[PDB]
Design a protein around this nucleic acid. Structure first.
Ligand SMILES: [Ca+2]
Ligand SMILES: [Ca+2]
Lengths: 483, 483
DNA sequence: AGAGAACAACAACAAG
DNA sequence: CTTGTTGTTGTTCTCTGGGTCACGC
DNA sequence: GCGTGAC
DNA sequence: AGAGAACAACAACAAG
DNA sequence: CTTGTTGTTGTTCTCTGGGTCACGC
DNA sequence: GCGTGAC
C-alpha cells in the first residue's frame, strides 16, 4: 500500500533520461503527464522487479505493427463486451445519439460519425460508437442509414424505434433519419439565427469588413509580432467566429492603430466606428456563453434550450439609447429566433424544461401538451419493465410534480436533484433523466472529428478506416468505463 | 551479459499495455520502435529491479515543464562540451557549413539555420549548429552575419576566415557571406537550369498545362479514390516537381482516361500527346538521380558536381530521331548549363574532382589551375600544424598523384580510399578529405527546417525560439556522437 | 465544450 | 539574506463545426 | 427541368 | 537525401 | 493438413526547398 | 528613382 520514493539521485536520472526520449523521437513534452503513459511505466518497473536490470527489451517491446493489430483486435472484443450494456439502455428509451458527416483533410474520405449519450444512474456517458468511411459513395441519405445500421450491427442493436437522434438540418442526414426520432441541433440553429441576421442587417457590413481588412493586413505584412493577443480571422464556417474576430480587434485597439500609423496605411482603421464595434461584442458576448452552454455533453443541455431563447430576447430588448443599425440588429435577431429557432423546436425541448424544478415560467398553453406527451412515454417505459420478468397513477403524478417549488441556489443542479427524488417518483424520474441525457447539439459528434483530425496527420496519413474507428472508440471507452 | 527473455504470458501483457498507451495519449504506433524510447524503458525496468513493484511514479515521473527546462539547460552544456571538438576542425580548414533562411508555418518567425559538416577520420558529421529567430527583423545581410556569429559565439569560434560556406544565390545570404568562402549550392543551380529551360521552351507548355489541369480535376472531384498511385501536383517551389507530376500521370495513364470518360470530361485528356510526355520523363528521370546524388551529406557530393554536368550534356546529345520541341528542350538545357551552372562554379568544384582517382577526364586547362590552388592551401594547413607545438616537397606531390590509376569497381569509394592512402601522402590527403567533406548543396540546412516543421505543429505551436534551437541540436547531437 | 501543448508569472522550498 | 532547482496556477495558441445532397416549383 | 436551402 | 508513419503482401512458425 | 499469431521485406504517403531583400541602370 | 533576379 505505502508507495516508495526514489532517491533524489535516482530522479535526476529519470529527468535526464526522459529528456533523451523527447529529443530523439520528437515527442511532445506532455507525453510524460499523459494518463495512458503513466500506467505503462508502472508495468515496466513491475517487470524489472520480477526479472531484473538485465532483460532483452527489443524482444520484449512489440513492433508497431503488432500494436496496430492489437488495437484492431482489442477493439472488436470491447464492442462485444459493451454489447449488453449498450443494448440495455437503448431498449429502456434512455438512449441519445448524435450523428454528423465529415471528410478528412488528407485522403478526403467521406466519413460518418455517431456518438451515444445515455444515463446509467448518477452520471452520463458520451462515447464514440464509430467513425466509418463511405469509401467514395454518393453520401445519400440511403447510404447513411445503411452505415448507421452497420455500426449498430456491431453492438447487435437493430430496431429503428427506441433511440433519440439529434442532428443538424443537412438534407442528407435529415432524410436518413425520417423514420424515427430526430432533434434539430440547437447549435446549428443558433448559428443560423445569428448568421442570417447580419446578412439581413448589411448596414453593419462596413464596420465588419474594415475589421476583416485590418486582420488580413497584419497577417500579410508579417505583423502581429506583438499586442500579446492575436487578431482572429472571420472564417464564417466556425461558430460565432464574428465575435471572436471583433473582440480580438477591440482588446488590442490601442496598439493596432499605432502599428497602422507607421505603415501609412491608417486609412484601413479611421473609418471604423469604435462605439459600434464595442456595442456588438457586448451583445455578442451573451451569445458566446449560450454557445458554450449548449455544447455540454458532460451535463444536461437540452433542458437549457428554451431558457436561452428568452435570454436572447432580453439581451435584444429595445433601448431608446441604442444607436440605429443596432436596433435593426436587435429586430432581426428576435425576428429570426421565431421563424428559425422556435419554428424548429419540438416537444422534447419543452419537456426537458418541464423537468427543471423552477419551471413556473410557462404555465400557459405548453402545460397541456406536456401532459399528453409524458403520459404516453411513461406507460411506454412501463411496457419495457414488464417485459423484464425472467396506486399513485400516471396522471396523479403529473399534477403532483407541478406544485414543487425549488429556489435556485448555485448548488442546485437538476442532475442529482432527481437522484435524491426518484424514490418518491419511480415511474416518472426515470423518464426525466432519459430526457436530460439528450445533448441538444452535434458538438459531441463534432469533437469526434477533431480527435479524428489529431490521429490522421501529415505523417500518419497512411492510416485507413477501421484503424481510426478503433483508435477513437478505445480512447473513448478508456475515459468512460475506466476510472 | 546474457540478457533475459520474458515469459510469453509476460509479453502478452506488454502488447496490451502498450496498446493502452497509444489510444489514450493519441501517440503514433512507431513510438515503441523509436531508439530514444527504447533506451528509456531499459531505465524503468532498472529502477523496478532495485526498488520493486511499489513505487510512486507520479512523483518519479517529471512534469513536462521540468522536461522543457532540462532540454534547455542540457543543450547549453552540450554546446560547451563540443566547443573544443568543433573549434579543432574549423581551425584545421576542414570545416564546411550550410546556411539558409526559413520561416515557420504558424508564428511566421523569420529563422536562420546553420549546419556544419566536417571530417573526423573515417566518417563525416552533419549536425545542427542552431536555428535562431530574427524576431521580426529586416532580414538584411547585416543581421544574418550578426546571428551567424551569435551561433558561433556559443561554441566560442570567432574568426571569419577558416570555414567554407555553401549556400544558394539569394541576395541576403550571398552578401552576408561576402567576406569569406562561399560556394553556390548545386541543387538550386540545377533547379535554376531546369526551370529556366522550360520557361524558354513554351512550345511544351500545352502538354504540361493539360496535365496540371488533369491533376486539378481529380483533386476537385474527390477523385483519386483509386489507381493505387496518386497524381502529384505542380507546386513549382519543390525541386524537380515537374517530373514527379508527369510520371504520376504516366504510370496511371490506363486508369485516368477511363475515369475521364464516365465524367464526359475526356476533353481534358485527348489533346495530350503521350509520345511526348513519355520522352520528357525519360530525360527527366536522369535528373532525378542527379538531384538525389547531390543532396548527400552522408558521403562526398561536391566531387560529383562536374561529373553530373557531363551526364546532363550527354542525356541531351541531339538525336535525329528526337521529335521537335524536344530538341529545342535539349538545346535550352545545355545552353543554360553553361551560363548558369558552369558560370557559377568555383575552383573548389574541380579540386574536389581532382581528388577522385579516375580524374583523367580533364587533363586540359584545369590542371594548372588546381596546381596553383592546392599548392597554397597545403602550406596553409601546414601553417596550422606548426602552431600545434605545445624531403618529398609540396610540388613533388602534385605530379606524384597525377599518375595514379584506379579502375572503378562498385566497391571503389573515394571516401575510404584516402584512409588507406594517407600514410604515403600525409600533407596532401588531409587537404583531400577537407574538400570531400563539403556538401555542395543546401539540402542539409533544408532538412533542418523539415525537422523544425515537425516539432512546431498545430498543437505545439506555442513553442518559442530556443526550445526549438535546443530540440534540434540535441536530436542531431544524439545521432552524431552517440552510437 | 472537450482535447492537445507550451509557456509567463509566479509560489513553495532548498543550498548557499 | 541572496541565489537556484522544482511545482503551481493561469493564459495563450490550436482543432470539429465540410466542398454537395434533397425538395419544390 | 433548375433554383434555393441547408451544409 | 534524411526523417516520420502506416500498411499489403508476404514468410517463418505455432497450435490445431 | 488446415488455421492463426508473429515478424519480415517492400511500397506508399508525407515534410525542407519561403512571401521579400540586394544590385544596376 | 524602379525593374530584374534571385528567392
Ligand atoms: Ca453536417
Ligand atoms: Ca534561401
Amino acid at each position: 500500500r505505502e508507495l516508495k520514493t526514489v532517491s533524489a539521485d535516482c530522479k535526476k536520472e529519470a529527468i535526464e533520461k526522459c529528456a533523451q526520449w523527447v529529443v530523439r523521437d520528437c515527442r511532445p513534452f506532455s507525453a510524460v503527464s499523459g494518463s495512458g503513459f503513466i500506467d505503462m511505466i508502472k508495468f515496466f518497473i513491475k517487470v524489472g522487479a520480477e526479472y531484473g536490470e538485465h532483460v532483452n527489451v527489443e524482444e520484449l517491446l512489440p513492433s508497431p505493427i503488432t500494436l496496430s493489430r492489437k488495437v484492431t483486435s482489442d477493439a472488436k472484443e470491447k464492442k462485444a463486451l459493451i454489447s449488453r450494456e449498450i443494448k440495455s439502455a437503448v431498449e429502456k428509451d434512455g438512449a441519445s445519439a448524435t450523428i454528423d458527416l465529415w471528410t478528412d483533410n488528407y485522403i478526403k474520405r467521406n466519413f460518418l460519425g455517431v456518438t451515444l449519450h445515455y444515463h446509467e444512474n448518477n452520471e452520463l456517458r458520451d462515447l464514440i460508437l464509430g467513425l466509418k468511411s463511405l469509401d467514395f459513395e454518393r453520401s445519400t441519405a440511403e447510404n447513411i442509414y445503411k452505415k448507421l445500421k452497420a455500426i449498430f450491427s456491431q453492438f447487435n442493436v437493430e430496431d429503428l424505434s427506441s433511440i433519440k437522434f439529434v442532428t443538424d438540418r443537412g438534407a442528407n442526414v435529415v432524410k436518413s433519419l425520417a423514420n424515427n426520432i430526430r432533434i434539430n441541433c440547437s447549435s446549428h440553429l443558433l448559428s443560423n439565427v445569428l448568421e442570417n441576421s447580419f446578412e439581413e442587417t448589411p448596414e453593419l457590413n462596413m464596420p465588419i469588413l474594415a475589421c476583416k481588412n485590418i486582420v488580413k493586413y497584419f497577417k500579410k505584412a508579417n505583423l502581429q509580432h506583438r499586442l500579446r493577443s492575436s487578431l482572429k480571422s472571420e472564417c464564417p464556417t466556425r461558430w460565432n467566429s464574428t465575435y471572436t474576430m471583433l473582440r480580438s480587434i477591440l482588446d488590442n485597439w490601442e496598439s493596432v492603430i499605432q502599428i497602422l500609423s507607421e505603415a501609412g496605411e491608417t486609412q484601413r482603421i479611421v473609418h471604423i466606428n469604435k462605439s459600434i464595434i464595442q456595442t456588438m461584442v457586448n451583445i455578442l458576448d451573451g451569445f458566446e456563453r449560450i454557445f458554450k452552454e449548449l455544447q455540454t455533453c458532460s451535463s444536461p443541455s437540452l433542458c437549457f434550450v428554451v431558457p436561452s431563447i428568452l435570454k436572447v430576447k432580453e439581451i435584444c430588448s429595445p433601448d431608446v439609447g441604442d444607436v440605429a443599425d443596432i436596433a435593426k440588429l436587435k429586430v432581426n435577431i428576435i425576428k429570426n429566433v421565431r421563424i428559425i429557432w422556435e419554428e424548429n423546436l419540438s416537444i422534447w425541448h419543452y419537456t426537458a424544461f418541464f423537468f427543471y424544478p423552477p419551471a413556473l415560467h410557462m404555465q400557459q398553453e405548453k402545460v397541456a401538451q406536456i401532459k399528453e406527451f409524458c403520459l404516453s412515454k411513461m406507460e411506454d417505459l412501463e411496457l419495457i419493465n414488464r417485459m423484464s420478468s425472467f396506486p399513485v397513477s400516471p396522471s396523479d403524478e403529473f399534477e403532483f410534480y407541478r406544485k414543487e417549488i425549488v429556489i435556485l441556489s448555485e448548488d442546485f443542479k437538476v442532475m442529482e436533484w432527481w437522484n435524491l427524488n426518484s424514490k418518491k417518483y419511480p415511474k416518472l424520474s426515470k423518464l426525466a433523466l432519459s430526457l436530460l441525457s439528450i445533448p441538444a447539439s452535434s458538438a459531441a459528434s463534432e469533437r469526434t472529428f477533431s480527435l479524428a483530425g489529431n490521429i490522421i496527420t501529415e505523417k500518419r496519413n497512411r492510416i485507413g478506416q477501421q484503424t481510426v474507428d478503433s483508435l477513437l472508440f478505445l480512447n473513448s471507452f478508456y475515459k468512460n468505463f475506466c476510472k
